[PDB]
Amino acid sequence: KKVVLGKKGDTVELTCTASQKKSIQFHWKNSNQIKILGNQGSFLTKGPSKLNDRADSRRSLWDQGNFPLIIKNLKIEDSDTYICEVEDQKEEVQLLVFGLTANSDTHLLQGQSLTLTLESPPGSSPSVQCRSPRGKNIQGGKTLSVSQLELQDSGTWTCTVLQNQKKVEFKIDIVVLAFQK
Amino acid sequence: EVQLVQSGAEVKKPGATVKISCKASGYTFSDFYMYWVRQAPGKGLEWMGLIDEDADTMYAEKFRGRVTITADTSTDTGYLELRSEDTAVYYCAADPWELNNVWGQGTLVSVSSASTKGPSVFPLAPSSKSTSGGTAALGCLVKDYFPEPVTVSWNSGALTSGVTFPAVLQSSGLYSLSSVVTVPSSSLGTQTYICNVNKPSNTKVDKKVEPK
Amino acid sequence: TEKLWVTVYYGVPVWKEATTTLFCASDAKAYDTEVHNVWATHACVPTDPNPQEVVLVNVTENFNMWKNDMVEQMHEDIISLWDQSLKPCVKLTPLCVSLKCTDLKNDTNTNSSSGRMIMEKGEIKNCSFNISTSIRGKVQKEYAFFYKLDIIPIDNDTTSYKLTSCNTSVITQACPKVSFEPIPIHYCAPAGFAILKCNNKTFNGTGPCTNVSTVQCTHGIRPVVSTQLLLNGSLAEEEVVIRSVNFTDNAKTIIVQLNTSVEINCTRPNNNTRKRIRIQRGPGRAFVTIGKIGNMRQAHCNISRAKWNNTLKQIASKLREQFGNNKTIIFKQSSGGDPEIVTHSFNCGGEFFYCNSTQLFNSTWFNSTWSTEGSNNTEGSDTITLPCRIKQIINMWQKVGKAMYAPPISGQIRCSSNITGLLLTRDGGNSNNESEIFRPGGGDMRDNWRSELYKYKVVKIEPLGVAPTK
Amino acid sequence: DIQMTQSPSSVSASVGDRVTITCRASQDISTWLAWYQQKPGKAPKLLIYAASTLQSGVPSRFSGSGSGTDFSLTINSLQPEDFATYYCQQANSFFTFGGGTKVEIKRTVAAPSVFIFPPSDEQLKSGTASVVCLLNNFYPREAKVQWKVDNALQSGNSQESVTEQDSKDSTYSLSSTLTLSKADYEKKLYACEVTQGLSSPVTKSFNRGE
């Protein structure tokens, strides 16, 4: 099983390769046997899947035997196990989507709290680590919070979310307002 | 009723991307053909191509394949695409009546090495003065400006008779024109002549010509 | 020693599996410049009058339409037929695959992509006097065991730029109007070979067939490329026949053969019509073109509602029988896809019509209420008109790409075809309770001809076997 | 593609003159032609769509004719407002335009007024110097201007532009500019020579210029 982690609102590629075979019929299905994506000859076909709108494939590589499933604007809900079914070859990829969000807006005065909440697919339990520009670390499994912010915290906060031995990097811009006596 | 509105003048460096848009109104854009035509200065009309409902497009041999014409039906808009050798005025045409009729106002695309630059105005004064003859040519030279149009007027437009010459393109890619008005020599002493230069560069130039 | 009994050895015909090129038989006039006629003249064999069939007795054979190689062979012929027949004004096909230039010929500076920046960075210029021989670039989605992007040197006549490489290969060539009228094509096995034909009135294309006959040639088949609806194919001898390798699998398509054909009538392209209008008496302005009307791109496909409605009912009943009585049968419009997939695309006269099948496929048959509503609507109405469009640029069915063809010159004729079958794709999936939803399907052109060749099997003949009296 | 050519390229004519401009298609376009009139500073206007069908607001005196590969537009009585530029367009498929025909006011020969403009002090300060020879109110438009520098004829260092025909008296004016470095300008004498309207060639030159 391949495990692919995607960031919310990004585009995720799921790769399917035929075993030493060129342009051939392939079909991508989800855990529930819903036909997400597939081909009929040279033509692309989409099923009733919710992904219908955002799921696509690159025909150019079909001749080579590569039949990727490309999902744009990936959403946490989309998280599922997708199986590329070829000529008696089932290639299984589990797709995880993560969305780390800054609850405390971006603009905070010194002494104000910073909260980062991770939107995660049900049944997941990733470890989330965030570093401030000054290098202060906040670690947690869901909501990561800093009780007090100093001016130095202003800038980009780097968050790593680790699930299934895979890491996704989120960059979060938090602004701490400078003030004078 | 039916109006075609083309995007404002666009100034680009050679090889730079220029996209000009024409928006349709007063008729069902989707149901009617849009045409694109370019006219080079001093030259006749050259029809680039047409676009249909299904995005199927025709192009002239010169533009074949190199130019793509795209139309946004949802916004009733059309788009073009050309280059510096084709620096010119571009017209978008439509055919709501199926009579090959309406045209847009036009878009000017200037593509040159030079960026928008203010004019340098040099007074052109007469040789010998009010004893030479009946009339004397009086002028101001507007040099090294880009692009167009540039307004050169005498005495705030009080003097317009025989004023101005068509711009000449420098190998540098800069524009220059002479603004010379023939004025009676006798009047030269009494009257003060001011050349007013302005436009895109937002540069106000008032040059007095004095044959001292 | 022998006995008073006389044993007579029976010359029993012996049949063995073989694959060979089937020789296309057709009746066509060489003089004609018509696509099919010229092709026949180029390469066909005459069709024998009254060939008849030789019926094999006490012979049962297992047939597999899906396995039947003849289908592939015919499909290859179809592909060749079309490619030569129709030359696009502009042909668009991708050249180069996932190749991205990171360094240009004669560069002494090593350039490198940076992911975090999303930008190219100058990795370092070479101190030694070396200039890059060829275009250096990375292959997208290609990872070595070392976990490294595969890099492929590119030698082009013209140097591609960093961030570029992989063109659409525009091919421009003449596209004059050429008449395309489908002509039935028989396929005849070469000498020493025969075609075994299952004679069962209802056969699902697979399994044992007791009633088998030897035929030199197949029945005449028109090479029509059609999506969703099977046009001008064979009609079911008995009741509606639905064929699928795996009905249970939603991915597998269902090919439906109809007992009676359904008329589909579209109109638009034909030979040029010449008209002269004087106007203004001549002087002051003379003889030109007026009366431009609407858009030729538009077309209408007329299908009689009653005939279609009855057809749907028959198909739905058969589907429900096959799946089992308990699930609903619903005909729904396509989920989406390319225009060819979305609509009933088919080629008439060398031009493809895209007809919106939504009106055809919008019915539910589980309830009497639905049945009543459909009946009443039918009673009020007469025919169903499907909006059709002809796109000059068409997605190539043979291979990934675009082909461009000249717009129709004139109208005045009717393009007609018999809807002899329906291609149904079932959504299925865990959640679809109490209901089964069928949507029109296509894109695998092989299917169109699979239905035709399901009963045909090509067999080698060797010396006759001798069967002693037993 | 198909060549669309119309001629004459330009026709000189008086008011009330009957003017025929002929458009020729290199290939048979049958009946698919259009006529457009264009004026300076103005977008094309449709005189005739489908060389036989009148657009409302077009005067009757405009007369179309012809077919196949050969069409002609005849102006029965040419008027000041009619004077302008004309284009013929193919309408069958590719809307290709003809070379263009300009109908301009014919008048008697007018002698050009000749002036020579030496560089200003500001221009000298720039370090780049241009000498402008001015021709005013001349007909016909054709003219030869010769840049003589210390008795040497020079080309490729000069650019010239000519104005559109005056509506008032139907004349043209020519601006000729000779561009040189300060050092080149310092050389001495510069002269511009014009010939045609005046029997003797006219040379305008400047010296010290007290």
Give the type of residue at D38.
Answer: Q
In a mutagenesis test of the C interface, which of B52, B64, B100 is the best target, namely the one with the most C β-carbons within 10 Å?
B52
In a mutagenesis test of the C interface, which of A39, A42, A51, A160 is the best target, namely the one with the most C β-carbons within 10 Å?
A42
Read off the tokens for D161: 């532009």
Chains that touch D (3 or more CB pairs under 8 A): B, C
- Asked whether the beta carbons of C422 and C184 are under 8 A apart, the reply is no
Give the CA-trace dihedral at C60, C64, C65, C69, to 10 degrees.
-110
Give the type of residue at C377.
Answer: N
DSSP letter (8 states) at residue A72: S
Closest CA in chain B for residue D51: B99
Give the type of residue at A25.
Answer: Q
CA distance C459 to C457: 6
The answer to whether B54 contacts C90, with C-beta atoms less than 8 Å apart, is: no
The answer to whether D89 contacts B47, with C-beta atoms less than 8 Å apart, is: yes
CA distance B170 to B120: 14
Q: Spell out the SS3 assignment of chain C.
A: CCCCCCCCCEEECCEEECCCCCEEECCCCCCCCCHHHHHHHHCCECCCCCCCCEEECCCCEEEECCCCHHHHHHHHHHHHHHHHHCCCCEEECCECCCEEEEECCCCCEEEEEECCCCEEEEEEECCCCCCCCCEEEEEEEEECCCCCEEECCECCCCCCCCCCCCECCEEECCCCCCCCCCCCEEEECCCCEEEEEECCCCCCCEEEECCEEEECECCCECCCCECCEEECCCCCCCCCEEECCCCCCCCCCEEEEEEEEEEEEECCCECCCCCCECCCCECEECCECCCCCCCCCEEEEEEEHHHHHHHHHHHHHHHHHHHCECEEEEECCCCCCCHHHHCEEEEECCEEEEECCCCCCCEECCCHHHHHHHHHHHHHCCEEEEEEECCCEEECCCCCCEEECCCCCECCCCEEEEEEEEEEEECCCCCCCCEEEEEECCCCCHHHHHHHHCCEEEEEECCCEEECCC
CA distance D15 to D103: 11
Which residues fall within 8 angstroms of residue C72, CB to CB, at 6 or more apart?
A: C446
- Asked whether the beta carbons of C262 and C224 are under 8 A apart, the reply is no
The answer to whether C141 contacts A15, with C-beta atoms less than 8 Å apart, is: yes
CA distance B56 to C390: 10
Cβ-Cβ contacts under 8 Å, C389 against chain B: 54
SS3 A147: coil
The answer to whether C297 contacts B98, with C-beta atoms less than 8 Å apart, is: no
Domains defined along chain A, listed by start: 1-98 (2.60.40.10), 99-173 (2.60.40.10)
Cβ-Cβ contacts under 8 Å, D126 against chain B: 120, 122
Angle between helices C35-42 and C69-85 (to 10 degrees): 120
Which residues fall within 8 angstroms of residue C406, CB to CB, at 6 or more apart?
A: C89, C175, C176, C177, C392
Strand partners, A164: none
Rounded to the nearest angstrom, the gap between the alpha carbon of residue D73 and the centroid of all alpha carbons in its chain is 21
The answer to whether C407 contacts B56, with C-beta atoms less than 8 Å apart, is: yes
SS3 B39: strand
SS3 B105: coil
Strand partners, D203: D193
Kind of pairing between the strands at A107-109 and A166-177: parallel
Kind of pairing between the strands at C328-331 and C435-440: parallel
- Tell which residue, C339, C83, D89, C350, has the closest CA to residue B55: C339
Q: Is D175 left (phi over 0), alpha (psi -120 to 50) or beta?
A: beta
Which residues fall within 8 angstroms of residue B97, CB to CB, at 6 or more apart?
A: none
Rounded to the nearest angstrom, the gap between the alpha carbon of residue D116 and the centroid of all alpha carbons in its chain is 23
**Start-to-end Cα distance in chain C:** 18
| Residue B52 contacts C, CB cutoff 8 Å | yes
The answer to whether D38 contacts B45, with C-beta atoms less than 8 Å apart, is: yes
Strands ordered across the beta sheet of D128-138:
D113-117, D128-138, D172-181, D158-162
- Asked whether the beta carbons of D95 and D31 are under 8 A apart, the reply is no
Q: Spell out the SS3 assignment of D122-151.
A: HHHHHCEEEEEEEEEEEECCCCEEEEEECC
CA distance B78 to C350: 30
Rounded to the nearest angstrom, the minimum Cα separation between D111 and chain B is 15
In a mutagenesis test of the A interface, which of C66, C99, C118, C400 is the best target, namely the one with the most A β-carbons within 10 Å?
C400
Q: Is B144 left (phi over 0), alpha (psi -120 to 50) or beta?
A: left
The answer to whether D122 contacts B123, with C-beta atoms less than 8 Å apart, is: yes
Cis peptide before C208 (omega within 30 of 0): no
CA distance A174 to A157: 7
Between the alpha carbon of residue C82 and those of residues C77, C177, C222, C426, D116, the distances in Å are 9, 14, 13, 30, 73
Read off the tokens for D162: 């000519």
SS3 A162: strand
- Tell which residue, B110, B64, A159, B103, has the closest CA to residue D1: B64
Read off the tokens for D96: 């290709």
Cis peptide before D8 (omega within 30 of 0): yes
The answer to whether D52 contacts C276, with C-beta atoms less than 8 Å apart, is: no
Total number of residues shown for chain C: 470
Which residues fall within 8 angstroms of residue C148, CB to CB, at 6 or more apart?
A: none
Residue bearing tokens 């330009």: D10
Cβ-Cβ contacts under 8 Å, D32 against chain B: none
Q: Quote the Cα angle for D127-D129-D132, to 5°.
A: 165
CA distance C431 to C428: 8
CA distance B43 to D97: 11
Nearest by CB: B54 against C292, C293, C297 = C297
Read off the tokens for B131: 């004893």
Q: What is the resolution of this structure in A?
A: 20.0
Nearest by CB: C98 against A27, A47, A61 = A61
Backbone phi, psi, residue C408, to 5°: -60, 140
Nearest by CB: C285 against D32, D51, D91 = D51
DSSP-assigned states of every residue in D9-74: SEEEE-TT--EEEEEEESS--TT-EEEEEE-TT---EEEEESTT-BPTT--TTEEEEEETTEEEEE
Largest CA distance in chain B: 73
The answer to whether C286 contacts D51, with C-beta atoms less than 8 Å apart, is: yes
CA distance A26 to B116: 56
CA distance C417 to C394: 21
Rounded to the nearest angstrom, the minimum Cα separation between D75 and chain C is 9
Closest CA in chain C for residue D47: C285
Read off the tokens for B134: 């009946």
Read off the tokens for C280: 């203004």
**Start-to-end Cα distance in chain B:** 58
Does an interface of 3+ CB pairs under 8 Å exist between C and D?
yes
**Start-to-end Cα distance in chain D:** 62
- Give kind and range of the element (H or E) at residue D185: helix D182-185
- Tell which residue, B153, B133, B182, B43, has the closest CA to residue D173: B182
CA distance C225 to C302: 19
CA distance A46 to B35: 36
Strands ordered across the beta sheet of C136-143:
C99-103, C136-143, C149-151
Read off the tokens for A150: 């100093």
